[PDB]
Amino acid sequence: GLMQFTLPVRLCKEIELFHFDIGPFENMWPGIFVYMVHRSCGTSCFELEKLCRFIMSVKKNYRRVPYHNWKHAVTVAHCMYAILQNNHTLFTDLERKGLLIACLCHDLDHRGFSNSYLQKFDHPLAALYSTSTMEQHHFSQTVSILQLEGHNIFSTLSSSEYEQVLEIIRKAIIATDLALYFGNRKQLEEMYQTGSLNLNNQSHRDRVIGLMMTACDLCSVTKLWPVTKLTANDIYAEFWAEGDEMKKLGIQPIPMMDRDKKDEVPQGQLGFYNAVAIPCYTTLTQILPPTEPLLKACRDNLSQWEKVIRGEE
C-alpha cells in the first residue's frame, strides 16, 4: 500500500504534458501506466498484484501490427491521464478508473484492418457485430481478460458500480469507432452553441466521454512534429497492407490505402486535419478548456504538412 511508483525526473516532468512520448523501452510502459493510475485515481483504487496481471494479459493480447499495437494502447491511455489531470473536479471516481482501463483495452486484438475490410472480406466478426465490428470485439476481449482468474481489478466494487464501470468502458470503447465521431461532435457542437450542454445529464456526459475517447485515440496528431511525422509512417504501413488485401479481393482501394499513391499523402493528411482532427480538438477545448494544448499541437502539425506540400520539406 505504501509502495509508490516513481519515474526518472525528465519523464516525471514530461508525463504531465499532453505531448509526452512514452519512449521506445517496452518494459517501462507498464510502470508508466501504473504511475498514471496511482496519480489519476489513487494508490488504493486497484490491488497492485491484480492490476499488474491485468496490464500484462492486455499487453499479451495486442498483436505485432505497425500502428494498432501495445504502444498505441499506452499512448492513448496517457492522453486520457493528461485530460483527467487538467480537469480534476469534473469526473467521478468510477469514470477515472473506467476510462484509464477503457483506453488501455480500446484496440484489444486489432489485426490492422478497418471495419470496411472485415465486411468486404466477410469475416465471422462482421456476422456477429454488424456495426462498430472491431470496437465491439475490443470490448468482448476486455470482458474476457476481466474474467480470467486473478484479473478482476474491480473486485472491491458493488454489483451496481461494477455494472456502471463496465458500461462506462463499453460506451467509451464503442466511441473509438470514428464513424460515430462525426455525428457525436455535431450534437455536442449544437448543444454547446445553444447552451443546453448539461454535465449532470447522463446522456450529455456519455457524448463528452465519447468526444474525449476520439481525441485520445488520434492524439499522435497532437505530438511534436518529429513524433507525429514518424507515427504517420506506422499508420500508413497498416493502410497500405489493407489496400493490398483489398486488391486481393479484386477491389481497387481508396487512395489513402493504395501504396502506388504515396504522392497524395501530404494532401490526404490536410483533409484529415481539416475534416477530423482540428474539429475534434476544437469542440473538446470549447467543452474542456484546459485541453487547449491538444488543439495548438494539432494546428502546428497541420501547418507542418502544408510545409511538406509547399516543398519546404
Ligand SMILES: CC(C)(O)CNC(=O)c1ccncc1NC(=O)c1nc(C2CC2)ccc1Nc1cncnc1
Ligand atoms: C472518415 C474516414 C475516411 O474514415 C476518416 N479519414 C481518414 O482516416 C484519413 C483520410 C486520408 N488520409 C488519412 C486518414 N486517416 C489518418 O491519417 C489517421 N487515421 C486515424 C484513425 C483510423 C482513423 C488515426 C490517425 C491518422 N493520421 C495520423 C496518425 N498518426 C500520426 N499522424 C497522422
Ligand SMILES: [Mg+2]
Ligand atoms: Mg480502434
Ligand SMILES: [Zn+2]
Ligand atoms: Zn485506437
